[PDB]
Design a protein around this nucleic acid. Structure first.
Lengths: 387, 65, 77, 70, 81, 98, 87, 100
RNA sequence: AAUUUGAAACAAUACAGAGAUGAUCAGCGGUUCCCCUGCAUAAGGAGAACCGUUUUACAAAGAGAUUUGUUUU
């Protein structure tokens, strides 16, 4: 069995993380560092304002437990003229999901602010391996604040999205709505004819392999009279789907179909990006630009949103936005090469998330990344002398 | 493709007109990726070798071969 | 380094800037960069020497291309 | 890269240079960028009457256009 | 404090009429719309002036144009008219 | 590395009629078809302007031009947003030296 | 036995604070005290003499200017460095 | 993208910076426009077949259609890319006194 | 080891931290290299980069080979 030493790694997190309460208004992140760096090597420091802005909180993630203990010995010391308190940060962490795709850290801080909850730390995930990732861990200042956030924020509708707010505990994680695809139970059937795009016929043709949970036929295939149609079929267990792959290269009706396990989206996007990065054509590449350098936490919705709110680009001018974290950048694919060229001109040197970014072609993005990674006689005499 | 042709051209007779309108007549013995040369048995317009800085080349007349 | 310290302690002094073409510019060095681009206020233009016939007197800042610059020197005369 | 100056490391060479200058002298040393140290240097401008003596010199590798034996 | 580079100071002249002296005894005057670190320039409402020597008398001719790109390598100096 | 500005500028003028005047005094009317990182120009359906005094071509409809031989590129005011050029320029000089 | 080598940039280093003559590609030279240089052999000279040089007769040389203070002489056109200066 | 692909193995007119035209066939090229060309002749006795032209010296490549039509010889003779006039300073002092 | 089209990637986006990943950004075989545990040597530790090899549904069409100090006079 694989065991839950998740409780191990979470205990490590709390155990080596401290909360410092009641630092002076004038105390910044740097001064927190100087005050505590004698306690032990520090991994991270967060500072947050109090509710009435009269003092500050700090979160310090220490490398090792002895450092957290040393930090806690500072409880009831006096800083400036403020008496601080140092304690382990515990049962003060939320996991939040399904905020709107365009919410930023500031939006989340302000969300908690609206109900008079100070947020000490908001931690967003890397989009390296899945561009769609969207959740957050939030450390607040008390166990009560955590319970209040769950009571008030779980189920709240924000921009049409039903928010999820939970007291953080990874063991309680929900089963995803796409888990069937993630689990390898969903097959994709390709190269069906229009005559064959029929749920009943597919059930008779595939149900021998195992119980079918679901059949999805993408819309628009009959209406646009496609030569080739696709369908997706989810089986209740992995063994059934695997055995159903034997229908590959087999005859169905009067057509020859392909059948394979459905790939997941992050995989498909990376293969699209891999295809793009190796390209030597030019009609497609000349319609896209790159922005760099960017945090691997920046989602396409934020980049699209940035183009709309800061650059005033029309939604339908953007064909696609793809992340390229191996070069710390992002690709924006537009509708014509002239518009792309003009966006290239407008965007280079602009500010995003408070930092100046540059635009350019793919090779430009790669290059930037790689680059960041006395008497004549006297003189004659010494030499002559050696000879 | 051109520097490739010079690489294989190793051992050919050649005439090199430089920016200074001087001529060199010799037998290519080495080029590099920057187009510098060394050539065997040479006429300036007497020498056995010569090194020619590629930036100072106007063009090279090769053999019809 | 010796060069960057030179650029630091010649800001504001009067200089002569000679181009490769032999044109000579005199005036107060308002700005200089690493590429030897120059901005000069009150620039006179002579050929080769300040003692020759005056070609131009300039009334605003003149910018000069570093790629064309042969030398820059302090004027003490 | 292509020419090992060591074979030329102590004889008189003929060096043509970019601005028209011709220089002859004994090769004392060199680097990868083809900067050279020459002794007994003579500088010719563009025959024999156009001759200046310079003694010990360094020719900048950046303006070298051709090198040969002398 | 800090360091205005000559390029930065020249960008202070953006949208204004400038005087450019070019290689080959030629000068332009126009309204500076753009330039880069190579001194490539886009001038609007420009006026080129070509100066020549007939034996011992100075003669000139002029061209005028709406919008003109200028390759930096021909530029010897920039100032104001 | 930098530049970019005029490269992007020219990418906006592809399919516009321009006149390229060269260091050799030759003037060429043509349709911009492509540009590269060195600002080499490929012009389609060319004709020598000023005068066909420079007949040396005649039987030439599309030319490649080495960026380093260009002296002037004449354009029309209709073709350019002078706001984008001034804004982009202030951002770019800022970029090349920082 | 094998007596050591001379490296050009090392010679130029050994010329700092001595007199030097810097000859350009054209018929022009600057004599002065070498203050320092950079990677590209841009040179800082102090109280430099600027000469135009007659090819036939070294006496009919022309002193273009006596410089005072320091000059930065761009290493673009620099053909030859002579430590100790002329003769 | 602007490559010299379309011009491969087709007849071409080359203008070199010296101000010399060339009729040729462009067999090869690199990303420095170093021209590998064959069956070159002026504009008009055949000089040769097979030469390397160095990109630095190329001003202009033009794509031609048929080799005849055309020939010429009473033309002011085209210049070079350099504009080394002569006594530019003389011209500038003339302009100074002209503005006085 | 390539591109374009048939060709529709569905299923409400989100649904558990660099605590993420399918060569998706990998495993394995090798080469070289940046420091430590240390006098040495020698376990082993933190690994980086290049080169072999292990993965890819079907069809058709046309065919990308450009390959990682010459362009700021």
């Amino acid at each position: 069995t694989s065991k839950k030493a998740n409780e191990a790694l979470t205990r490590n997190r709390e155990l080596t993380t401290v909360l410092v309460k009641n630092l002076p208004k004038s105390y910044n992140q740097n001064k927190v560092y100087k005050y505590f760096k004698h306690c032990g090597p520090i991994i991270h420091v967060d500072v947050a304002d109090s509710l009435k802005k009269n003092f500050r909180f700090a979160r310090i993630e220490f490398a090792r437990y002895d450092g957290a203990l040393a930090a806690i010995t500072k409880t009831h010391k006096v800083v400036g003229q403020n008496e601080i308190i140092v304690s382990h940060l515990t049962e003060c962490t939320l996991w939040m999901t399904n905020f709107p795709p365009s919410y930023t850290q500031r939006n989340i801080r302000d969300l908690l602010q609206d109900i008079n909850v100070v947020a000490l730390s908001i931690r967003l995930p890397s989009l390296r391996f899945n561009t769609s990732r969207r959740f957050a861990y939030i450390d607040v200042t008390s166990k009560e604040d955590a319970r209040y956030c769950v009571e008030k924020l779980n189920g709240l509708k924000i921009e049409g999205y039903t928010l999820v707010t939970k007291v953080s505990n990874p063991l309680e994680k929900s089963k995803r709505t796409d888990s069937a695809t993630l689990e390898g139970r969903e097959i994709m059937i390709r190269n069906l004819s229009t005559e064959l795009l029929d749920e009943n016929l597919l059930r008779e043709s595939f149900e021998g392999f195992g119980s079918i949970e679901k059949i999805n036929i993408p819309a628009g295939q009959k209406e646009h009279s496609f030569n080739n149609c696709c369908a997706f079929m989810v089986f209740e267990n992995k063994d059934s789907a695997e055995r159903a792959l034997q229908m590959n290269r087999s005859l169905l009706g009067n057509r020859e179909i392909s059948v394979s396990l459905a790939d997941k989206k992050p995989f498909l996007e990376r293969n699209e990006v891999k295809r793009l990065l190796a390209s030597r054509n030019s009609k497609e590449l000349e319609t896209l630009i790159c922005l760099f350098p960017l945090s691997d936490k920046v989602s396409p919705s934020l980049i699209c949103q940035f183009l709309q709110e800061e650059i005033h680009i029309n939604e339908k001018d953007i064909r696609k936005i793809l992340l390229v974290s191996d070069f710390n950048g992002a690709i924006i694919i537009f509708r014509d090469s002239k518009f792309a060229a003009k966006m290239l001109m407008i965007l280079n040197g602009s500010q995003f998330q408070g930092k100046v970014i540059r635009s350019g072609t793919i090779n430009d993005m790669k290059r930037y990344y790689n680059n960041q990674q006395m008497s004549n006689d006297d003189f004659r005499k010494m030499f002559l002398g050696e000879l | 493709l051109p520097l490739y042709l010079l690489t294989n051209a190793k051992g050919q007779q050649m005439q090199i007109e430089l920016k200074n309108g001087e001529i060199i007549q010799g037998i290519l013995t080495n080029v590099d990726n920057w187009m510098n040369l060394t050539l065997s048995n040479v006429t300036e317009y007497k020498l056995n070798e010569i090194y020619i800085r590629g930036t100072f080349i106007k063009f090279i007349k090769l053999q019809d071969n | 380094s010796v060069t960057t310290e030179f650029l630091s302690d010649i800001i504001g002094k009067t200089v002569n800037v000679k181009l490769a073409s032999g044109l000579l510019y005199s005036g107060r060095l308002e700005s200089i960069d690493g590429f030897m681009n120059v901005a000069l206020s009150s620039a006179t233009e002579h050929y080769e020497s300040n003692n020759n016939k005056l070609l131009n007197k300039f009334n605003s800042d003149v910018f000069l291309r570093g790629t064309q610059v042969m030398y820059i020197s302090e004027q003490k005369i | 890269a292509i020419l090992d100056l060591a074979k030329y490391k102590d004889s008189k060479i003929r060096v043509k240079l970019m601005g028209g200058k011709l220089v002859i002298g004994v090769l004392k040393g060199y680097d990868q960028l083809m900067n050279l140290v020459l002794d007994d240097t003579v500088e010719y401008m563009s025959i024999s009457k156009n001759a200046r003596k310079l003694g010990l010199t360094v020719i900048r590798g950046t303006i070298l256009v051709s090198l040969s034996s002398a | 404090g800090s360091m205005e580079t000559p390029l930065d100071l020249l960008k202070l002249n953006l949208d204004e009429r400038v005087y450019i002296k070019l290689r080959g005894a030629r000068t332009l005057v126009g309204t500076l719309q753009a330039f880069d670190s190579h001194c490539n320039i886009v001038l609007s409402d420009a006026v080129e002036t070509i100066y020549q020597l007939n034996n011992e008398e100075l003669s000139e001719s002029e061209r005028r144009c709406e919008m003109v790109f200028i390759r930096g390598d021909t530029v010897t100096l920039i100032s104001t008219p | 590395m930098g530049s970019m500005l005029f490269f992007s500028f020219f990418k906006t003028l592809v399919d516009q009629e321009v006149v390229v005047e060269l260091k050799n005094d030759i003037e060429i009317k043509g349709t911009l078809q492509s540009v590269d990182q060195f600002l080499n120009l490929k012009l389609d359906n060319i004709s020598c302007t000023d005068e066909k005094k420079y007949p040396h071509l005649g039987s030439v409809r599309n030319i490649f031009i080495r960026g380093s031989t260009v002296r002037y590129v004449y354009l029309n005011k209709n073709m350019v947003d002078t706001n984008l050029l001034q804004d982009a320029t202030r951002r770019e000089v800022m970029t090349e030296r920082k | 036995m094998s007596l050591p080598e001379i490296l050009p940039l090392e010679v130029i280093d050994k010329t700092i604070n001595q007199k030097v003559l810097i000859v350009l590609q054209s018929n022009r030279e600057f004599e002065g005290t070498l203050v320092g240089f950079d990677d590209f052999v841009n040179v800082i000279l102090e109280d430099a003499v600027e000469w135009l040089i007659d090819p036939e007769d070294e006496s009919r040389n022309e002193k273009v200017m006596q410089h005072h203070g320091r000059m930065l002489l761009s290493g673009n056109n620099i053909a030859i460095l002579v430590p100790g200066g002329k003769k | 993208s602007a490559t010299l692909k379309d011009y491969l193995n087709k007849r071409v007119v080359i203008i070199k910076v010296d101000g010399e035209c060339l009729i040729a066939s462009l067999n090869g090229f690199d990303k420095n426009t170093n021209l590998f060309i064959t069956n070159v002749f002026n504009r008009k006795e055949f000089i040769c077949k097979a030469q390397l032209l160095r990109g630095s010296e190329i001003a202009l490549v033009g794509l031609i259609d048929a080799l005849a039509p055309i020939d010429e010889k009473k033309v002011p003779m085209l210049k070079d890319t350099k504009n080394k006039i002569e006594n530019e300073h003389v011209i500038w002092e003339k302009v100074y006194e002209s503005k006085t």
